[PDB]
Design a protein around this ligand. Structure first.
Ligand SMILES: [Zn+2]
Ligand SMILES: [Zn+2]
Ligand SMILES: [Zn+2]
Lengths: 332, 70, 110, 66, 331, 814, 81
RNA sequence: GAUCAAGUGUAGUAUCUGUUCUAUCAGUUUAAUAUCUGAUA
């Protein structure tokens, strides 16, 4: 029974979205993952309607997307993490209406594997470095450089592997033009595996670890690591340098916490609940996703709860120190 | 062979029921995290957000089968 | 120390504790997990260990031309006109020493 | 029979090297195995014009031991 | 929690219509437990516009599938397959089969054959012996499949889909016998027996393909008036696709060569091997990816030339043969 | 004292012995580093680094020590920085790239270890030094300091240095550091660029010629590093540079022209126009300059300005080309290889913008020149231009001059020149159909040079035929190609293999052109002449001879006997395993032609008889040959013969057909699908058989069948073969068990990981350790191979009292 | 033994005698994937080493089709040591 | 089948000739044996 497969209706569900000047022009597009398909969208700022410019079956499981830009560049690259086990960088070519594969670097076997990288993708804001991280143990960092011709160049991967470590999320920290840093929410599971009582599992704490890439010495150092009060589900990169105070918001169960390395104290804000909520009181509340808006003189985050309620989040600063997190309810 | 030890979740002649099942459960949860459709299925079945399903799976990675045998 | 080699189920006890007493062999009792072993031996499409694993001798220390060949064009047609599939063993039918001695139209045919 | 006779010859040094291509040897030649005679009659005929007409370790040269 | 539904007539009541709804009571998903279940019966009335409640019948475990069978209803309660007559105050269990390996997800029927979807142990073929009042397992699959949905292609053939984004087609080999006994003393569960700890006869997997995404519907149908018949599937990411039979080698071997050349000349964007992707859980078998073949039209003319040359054709002929197979079944 | 001897022991175990000894000793030094102390440890390490005898790999391992002890010691190095640095600094100036990068690495590590203030306080007294060599190294040290640390960190020091009024030497060194930073960092400069330009900017204006020179070079280096971005940063320096261009002279002007040359490519099209025109008023004046350093610069600036987008092709055509050709395209410029390559490049870039014909028409008049080296220069330029742009732009009247000149140059060079061969081949291949009128002149010129008495000169004539016979096809081809071939047929007796290889390479080019009936040495005369040549020892001869016998077999099979072909196959047979890749590929291609020529039957019968009677070396060659006769011609013609050889009741012939099958399946790949069912019963017999080598190589057939047929169905036949492979899992002989692992790793792909798991389950927890060891070895291969696929295939395992083992999410219903 | 460090940007090389062989399986059939080696194995004297024997490399090393299918391109830097 | 001595050969794996095996218990060990180490005759 020989058979021919045809798609009639492409998948419509979205699992990742990134925004950027993928065309290399003033206007912004959105690249969306539909799991098996990569798609480019243009919202028309006049008509409001959203136009699908390009759809490509990638015959793989997309697991992470990041936009990134080399310092000085006009155009955003798409870096893709997938079940393939190869880190792929794409450039949208507006003239040919195609995604062009600028680099493909190989680091492991294929499938949605536990210890092979691809699930988590973090890029330095300046675009200097990209870190691809597996759920467990294996994390790899690729340095990014611009050649004379302005074509993209990918450095050989630098190993940053810590055994028995589960990673919940990784984000690039904005350090301005200092050495790139990545932040990971990680839990070490070695003690739970060796404790017959189960106390070790209960007393295992997630840590926030900052891995710094010393660009000069080509090595990745696990420079700071710190236990959190409660388990975070994801991280948000806070604007750094001139733009902001740097650091990373941890979204966690019932809370949002701001952390930075050095003299910066922890600031923690509870997630506001709905008045008269009919929900089961045993249920905690998490933020499910976030967007950042960075503007010429200010920034804010939008973060959405499990109920669909969006909070605008702002950070008050005195000198370069955050002093409070402010949450205004925005919309549902 | 020795080099198989580079790869977590392999076994050997003195691998126990608990060691083997803990690797099956950890590999399963990592697979669920990667396969967007398999994650869709669980979110719809539980009536729970994909972000909470992912979080609950990550929490289950620590001690997926309960404590070691003794 | 020999003590743990005494700290085992009897064959009787293992035979009664399990859903499938017909898969329980004398040796199974001596395993590090006889209850997991007997469970795996009972799984619905699982293949038994080659029976010679306990034999003192090494494995095998105890041709005819297929009909369509044996039967330019003739030699092509042996492969592309009259070639029959041989008798094929089913999944799990391991070789061993003594092995040898309503309408019904099919959907999606051509 | 593995014995072969040869005519239209030019040394023993030439002869053995020349005939070794048709298979292992233990004017006239003596091959290990009969099929060398088929090869000689096919190939060494006409190869001057050459002309042709009809223990353990020695056999162990034909073995496929790794 | 309603998990199953059927609309049917019963032999005893003739014309009268009934809706049977299978319900779990206090189901906990993880770790799994349940306070048994119910089947609710309603008499469909007012030309199928109103549900008149008739009775609520308790059952021991979730009635996860319901299927009308020979003027009676077949309900799968956990691992038990049971035939239920309508009754008056409650459904009556005419027959029961306890030999299903695990939880039953779905039930298809054709003639006296019943195809049961196990949650993990894939497809079991059962015959109802009408006079003898028995449900007999006569064949099973040789693989575990986490079946989500199933469709009958013919009397011998089942298309299935699973939780891991695969489709398969399983067929009973020729001269499979459905006229099988079960022993009244116990012999066929003691002496006489099945193969590999399953049934005595096995289904052949004649097709395997990783769709790349979980399928919860399969239906054999014609999508266009006077078009060819197709197997239509739908997915959790909202995709709709078809699997369509090639009518001859003049199609099949051509698209086989097209797929082979596109695998090398136009490899997947994010660095996967295509053959590996379509072979994710099982090796790909008897399916050609038209989602890859139709990328021919999106290649630069340099590659379109080179690929078409290795196919003995010009690019317009390749593009046309792609359009021809789509329009024959799909819109 | 004795612990310093332990440092010697540890150094010895790093410098000598096995890698784990090195690894252990390094771990020892590095963790002990705190105890040893920086002073003693560097008093001992630096003498090795100073030794002239130290190899690159010894130095590299000593660097791999130095990094780690520097990390461990940290602040402890501060008193010793001065001593450490002066030993290291010379590496930064070494001509060896690896010695150089290693010096940068250890200065980087030393700068991470020591505080910035200490690096500054160490190197500051050398900023002010009288020796330019000391300043030069110090500038390179500080550039590396800047690279390891943040560039902003060093900026406040540079701001003090570049305004150090009391010493021009200091201000100069500051700007050297700013230049060296740009050379080291590259495009990483860009976010710090305006900060660096604003440090240099006042230097261009200074009262000291040295400081103006180095500041212009700093701006050149920054512009080079920034390319194509960063123009907004340089807006400060644009005015100072023109005010300098209009005023300065000599190498002090060459510096400013260098800066400008790197700035113009950064500019927008409007500024590119304005500032290019500003250049030319002075750059055209410098075309007259006697200085070779200046001449190097002005060609660079021309290349950069004319390569920029803004500048009109018409502007170049009117204002650049006349003075450029006047001053540079003259005989004196051929004399120096530096100027030569620079002029050729600059000129090719002018062609890229202005067109082929505009440049070529100013050059071609000198193809007929006196001087060989100047004719070489123009020929290399025409070579490059027509390689880039082709003949399209060229007028008929310019073809005439090209070809006349090209012919004259070829007949003129006393010694075979590669450039003349390139130029002639390129121009003829570019012109193509247009060459038709000139073919008699070309042919006569070739034929003349092919009758020359010199070996090398005839090699060059044959090479030229080889590169151009495709054009010579055009007309009277039978007449001209044919006589060239008869001349080549005489040279088939060449004493020199370098030449003979080219004769063959020219004959090969003729038969790829001529219809074989019109051959002038008939094929009956050609092939016998080649048969002794196949045995020549020289690679070039063998390649071209085998490849030529290839084309005769391919294109003209009919002209020679079956037996003639048969003898050729039997001689070619060993070359299938020759050392050289080219010789093997030629043999494989051409055995494939000759197998078609003979027809498969008797060539195969001959190969199967050879397979019974030769040594292991030639027997493996027949397994390769039999597979070529299968992939070429028909596989279905090969397998029936192999099936019959397996019916012979002798272990050696039977073992032979298994090697033949194992390579046949590797080699034919995807074609194997048609043949699995036919070969299956042979593999049953072979894999049931008592012989260890039968079972080894039947397993190897199963590996190659499996990997060859992946995705084409056939899993029924592969499941069946797995029932005969699998019992061999307890074999103990190294060769059989590695072949069995190979087969299982093959079948994991073609049957899938589910099936392979179903064969493993009953053995993973079997009572016997010798079953478990074997089953876990197999499982681990399946697991590493297919980790994510196994998720679907793992059996249901029930919960225990203490432990949960069901996977509940997969039990869920929708 | 094989090196099995994570591979990088450096391409593996082969000497003339070993030209066209697959480093992993030593077959000469169907080279498919370019061999990539770790930076350490391609540094200084080590730069340009034949992957199989360490001789000067005249050509790029290529993993065979059979090895690429089995994902044996992915195990890490196949420099023999 | 295990085990001791001797010849021979190879990149590596080994082949090949001449011996031993006669009672129980305990320990070590093994899937179970066996070997090995003690004890009783
Ligand atoms: Zn290989
Ligand atoms: Zn390496
Ligand atoms: Zn080599």
């Amino acid at each position: 029974m020989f058979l021919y497969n045809l798609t009639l209706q492409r998948a419509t569900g979205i699992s990742f979205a990134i925004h950027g000047n993928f065309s290399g022009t003033k206007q912004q597009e959105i690249v969306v993952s539909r799991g098996k398909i990569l798609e480019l969208l243009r919202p028309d700022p006049n008509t409001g309607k959203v136009h699908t410019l390009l759809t490509v079956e990638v015959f793989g499981v997309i697991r992470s997307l990041m936009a990134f830009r080399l310092t000085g560049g006009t155009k955003d690259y798409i870096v893709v993490g997938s079940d393939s086990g190869r880190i792929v960088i794409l450039e949208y070519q507006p003239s040919k209406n195609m995604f062009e594969k600028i680099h493909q670097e190989t680091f492991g076997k294929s499938g949605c594997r536990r210890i092979v990288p691809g699930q988590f993708l973090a890029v330095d804001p300046k675009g200097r470095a990209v870190m691809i991280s597996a759920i467990e143990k294996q994390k790899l960092v690729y340095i990014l450089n611009r050649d004379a011709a302005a074509r993209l160049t990918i450095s050989s991967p630098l190993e940053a592997h810590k055994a028995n470590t589960l990673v919940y999320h990784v984000v690039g920290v904005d350090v301005g033009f200092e050495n790139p840093m990545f932040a990971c929410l990680e839990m070490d599971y070695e003690e739970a595996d060796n404790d017959p009582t189960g106390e070790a599992a209960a007393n295992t704490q997630q840590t926030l670890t900052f891995y710094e890439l010393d660009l000069g010495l080509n090595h990745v150092v696990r420079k700071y690591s710190e236990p959190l009060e409660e388990h975070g589900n994801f991280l948000i990169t806070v604007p750094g340098g001139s733009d902001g105070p740097s650091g990373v918001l941890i979204c966690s169960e019932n809370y949002i916490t701001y952390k930075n390395f050095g003299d910066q104290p922890d600031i923690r804000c509870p997630i506001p609940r709905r008045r008269n909520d009919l929900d089961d009181p045993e249920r905690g509340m998490i933020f499910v996703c976030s967007a950042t808006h960075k503007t010429k003189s200010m920034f804010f985050f939008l973060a959405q709860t499990e109920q669909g309620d969006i909070f605008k989040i702002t950070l008050e600063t005195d000198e370069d120190m955050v002093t409070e997190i402010r949450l205004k309810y925005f919309d549902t | 062979e020795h080099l198989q030890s580079k790869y977590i979740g392999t076994g050997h002649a003195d691998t126990t029921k608990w060691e083997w099942l803990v690797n099956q459960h950890r590999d399963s949860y990592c697979s669920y995290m990667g396969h967007f459709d398999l994650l869709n299925y669980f979110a719809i079945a539980e009536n729970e957000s994909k972000a909470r399903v992912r979080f609950n799976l990550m929490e289950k990675m620590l001690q997926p089968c309960g404590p070691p045998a003794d | 120390k020999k003590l743990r080699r005494m700290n085992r189920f009897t064959v009787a006890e293992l035979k009664q504790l399990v859903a499938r007493p017909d898969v329980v062999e004398m040796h199974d009792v001596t395993a590090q997990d006889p209850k997991l072993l007997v469970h795996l031996k009972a799984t619905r499409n699982s293949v038994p260990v080659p029976r010679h694993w306990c034999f003192k001798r090494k494995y095998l220390q105890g041709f005819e031309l297929p009909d369509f060949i044996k039967r330019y064009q003739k030699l092509h047609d042996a492969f592309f006109k009259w070639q029959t599939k041989p008798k094929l063993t089913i999944h799990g039918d391991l070789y061993y020493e003594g092995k040898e001695f309503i309408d019904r139209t099919p959907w999606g045919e051509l | 029979n593995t014995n072969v006779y040869v005519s239209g010859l030019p040394t023993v040094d030439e002869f053995i090297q020349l005939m070794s291509k048709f298979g292992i040897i233990m004017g006239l030649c003596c091959y290990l195995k009969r099929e060398s005679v088929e090869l000689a009659l096919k190939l060494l005929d006409e190869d001057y014009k050459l002309h042709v007409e009809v223990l353990s370790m020695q056999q162990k040269q034909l073995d496929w031991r790794p | 929690a309603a998990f199953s539904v059927a609309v049917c007539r019963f032999s005893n009541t003739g014309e009268d219509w009934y809706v049977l709804v299978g319900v779990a009571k206090d189901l906990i998903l993880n770790p799994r437990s349940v306070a048994g279940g119910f089947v609710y019966t309603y008499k469909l009335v007012n030309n199928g516009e109103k549900l008149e409640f008739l009775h609520k019948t308790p059952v021991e475990e979730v009635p996860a599938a319901i299927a009308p069978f020979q003027g009676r209803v077949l309900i799968g309660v956990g691992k038990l397959l049971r035939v239920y007559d309508l009754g008056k105050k409650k459904l009556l269990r005419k027959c029961e089969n306890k030999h299903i390996a695990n939880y039953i997800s779905g039930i298809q029927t054709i003639g006296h054959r019943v195809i049961v979807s196990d949650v993990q142990e894939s497809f079991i073929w059962v015959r109802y012996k009408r006079n003898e009042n028995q449900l007999i397992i006569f064949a099973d699959d040789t693989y575990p499949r986490w079946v989500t949905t199933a469709s009958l292609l013919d009397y011998d053939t089942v298309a299935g889909a699973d939780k891991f984004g695969n489709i398969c087609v399983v067929r009973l080999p020729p001269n499979t016998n459905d006229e099988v006994d079960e022993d009244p003393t116990g012999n066929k569960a003691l002496w006489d027996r099945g193969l590999l700890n399953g049934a005595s006869q096995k289904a052949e997997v004649i097709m395997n393909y990783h769709v790349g995404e979980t399928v919860l519907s399969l239906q054999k149908t014609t999508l266009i008036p006077g078009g060819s018949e197709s197997l239509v599937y739908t997915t959790l990411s909202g995709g709709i696709g078809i699997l369509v039979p090639f009518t001859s080698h003049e199609d099949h071997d051509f698209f086989q060569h097209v797929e082979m050349h596109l695998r090398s000349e136009h490899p997947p964007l994010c660095g996967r091997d295509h053959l590996s992707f379509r072979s994710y859980y099982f090796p790909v078998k008897n399916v050609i990816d038209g989602d890859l073949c139709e990328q021919f039209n999106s290649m630069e003319p340099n590659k379109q030339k080179n690929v078409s040359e290795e196919l003995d054709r010009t690019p317009p002929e390749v593009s046309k043969k792609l359009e021809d197979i789509r329009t024959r079944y799909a819109f | 004292e004795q612990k310093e001897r332990k440092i010697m022991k540890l150094l010895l175990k790093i410098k000598n012995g096995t890698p784990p000894m090195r690894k252990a000793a390094l771990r020892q030094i590095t963790d002990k580093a705190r105890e040893f102390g920086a002073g003693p440890l560097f008093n001992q390490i630096l003498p090795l680094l100073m030794s002239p005898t130290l190899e690159d790999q010894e130095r590299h391992l000593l660097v791999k020590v130095i990094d780690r002890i520097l990390y461990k010691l940290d602040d402890l190095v501060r008193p010793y920085v001065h001593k450490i640095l002066v030993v290291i600094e010379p590496l930064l100036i070494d001509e060896d790239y690896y010695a150089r990068v290693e010096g940068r690495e250890i200065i980087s590590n030393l700068a991470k270890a020591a505080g910035l203030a200490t690096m500054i306080s160490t190197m500051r007294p050398d900023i002010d030094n009288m020796d330019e060599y000391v300043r030069n190294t110090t500038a390179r040290a500080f550039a590396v300091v800047a690279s390891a640390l943040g560039i902003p960190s060093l900026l406040p020091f540079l701001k003090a240095v570049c305004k150090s009024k009391k010493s021009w030497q200091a201000r100069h060194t500051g700007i050297k550091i700013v230049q060296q930073i740009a050379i080291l960092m590259g495009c990483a400069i860009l976010p710090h660029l305006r900060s660096l330009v604003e440090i240099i900017e006042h230097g261009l204006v200074d009262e000291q010629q040295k400081v103006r020179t180095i500041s212009a070079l700093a701006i050149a280096a920054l512009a080079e590093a920034a390319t194509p971005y960063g123009i907004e940063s340089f807006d400060s320096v644009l005015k100072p540079l023109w005010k300098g261009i209009r005023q300065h002279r000599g190498k002090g002007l060459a510096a400013f022209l260098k800066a400008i040359g790197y700035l113009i490519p950064l500019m927008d099209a409007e500024y590119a126009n304005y500032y290019t025109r500003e250049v030319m008023l002075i750059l055209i004046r410098e075309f007259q300059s006697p200085d070779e350093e200046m001449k190097k610069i002005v060609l660079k600036v021309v290349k950069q300005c004319c390569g920029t987008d803004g500048v009109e092709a018409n502007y170049i055509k009117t204002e650049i080309l006349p003075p450029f050709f006047k001053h540079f395209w003259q005989h004196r410029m051929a004399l120096d290889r530096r100027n030569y390559r620079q002029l050729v490049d600059t000129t090719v870039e002018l062609a890229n913008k202005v067109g082929a014909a505009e440049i070529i028409s100013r050059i071609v008049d000198d193809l007929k020149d006196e001087a060989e080296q100047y004719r070489k220069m123009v020929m290399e330029t025409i070579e490059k231009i027509m390689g880039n742009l082709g003949a399209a732009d060229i007028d008929h009247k310019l073809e005439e001059q090209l070809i006349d000149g090209i012919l004259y140059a070829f007949q003129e060079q006393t010694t075979e020149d590669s450039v003349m061969l390139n130029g002639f081949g390129t121009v003829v291949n570019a012109l193509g159909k247009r060459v038709k009128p000139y073919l008699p002149q070309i042919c006569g010129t070739v034929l003349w040079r092919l009758n020359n008495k010199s070996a090398k000169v005839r090699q060059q004539a044959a090479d030229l035929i080889s590169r151009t016979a495709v054009v010579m096809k055009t007309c009277q081809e039978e007449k001209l190609m044919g006589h060239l071939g008869v001349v080549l047929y005489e040279y088939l007796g060449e004493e020199y293999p370098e030449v003979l290889g080219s004769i063959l390479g020219a004959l090969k080019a003729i038969v790829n052109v001529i219809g074989m009936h019109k051959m002038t040495p008939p094929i009956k005369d050609l092939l016998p002449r080649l048969t002794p040549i196949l045995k020549n020892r020289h690679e070039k001869v063998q390649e071209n001879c085998i490849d030529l016998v290839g084309r005769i077999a391919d294109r003209g099979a009919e002209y020679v006997s079956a037996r003639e072909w048969m003898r050729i196959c039997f001689e070619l047979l060993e070359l299938l395993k020759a050392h050289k890749k080219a010789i093997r590929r030629a043999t494989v291609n051409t055995f494939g032609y000759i197998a078609k020529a003979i027809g498969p039957h008797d060539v195969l019968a001959t190969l199967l008889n050879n397979l019974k009677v030769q040594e292991r070396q030639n027997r493996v060659c027949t397994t390769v040959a039999i597979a070529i006769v299968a992939e070429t011609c028909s596989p279905f013609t090969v397998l029936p013969a192999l099936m019959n050889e397996y019916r012979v009741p002798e272990l050696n012939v039977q073992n032979g057909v298994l090697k033949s099958l194992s390579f046949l399946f590797e080699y034919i790949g995807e074609m194997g699908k048609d043949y699995i069912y036919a070969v299956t019963p042979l593999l049953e017999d072979a894999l049931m058989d008592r012989d260890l080598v039968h079972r080894q190589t039947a397993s190897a057939v199963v590996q190659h069948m499996s990997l060859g047929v992946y995705g084409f169905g056939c899993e029924d036949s592969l499941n069946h073969l797995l029932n005969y492979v699998w019992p061999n899992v307890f074999e103990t002989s190294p060769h059989v068990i590695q072949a069995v692992m190979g087969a299982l790793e093959g079948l994991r792909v073609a049957i899938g990981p589910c099936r392979m798991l179903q064969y493993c389950l009953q053995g993973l927890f079997h009572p016997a350790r010798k079953v478990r060891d074997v089953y876990w070895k197999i499982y681990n291969s399946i697991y590493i191979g297919s980790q994510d696929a196994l998720i679907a295939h793992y059996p249901r395992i029930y919960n225990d009292d203490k432990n949960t083992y069901i996977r509940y999410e997969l039990d869920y219903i929708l | 033994i094989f090196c099995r460090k994570q591979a990088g940007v450096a391409i593996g090389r082969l000497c003339e005698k070993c030209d066209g062989k697959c480093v992993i399986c030593d077959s000469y059939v169907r080279p498919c994937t370019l061999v990539r080696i770790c930076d350490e194995c391609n540094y200084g004297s080590y730069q340009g080493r034949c992957v199989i024997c360490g001789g000067p490399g005249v050509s790029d090393a290529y993993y065979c089709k059979e090895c690429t299918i089995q994902e044996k391109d992915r195990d890490g830097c196949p420099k023999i040591v």
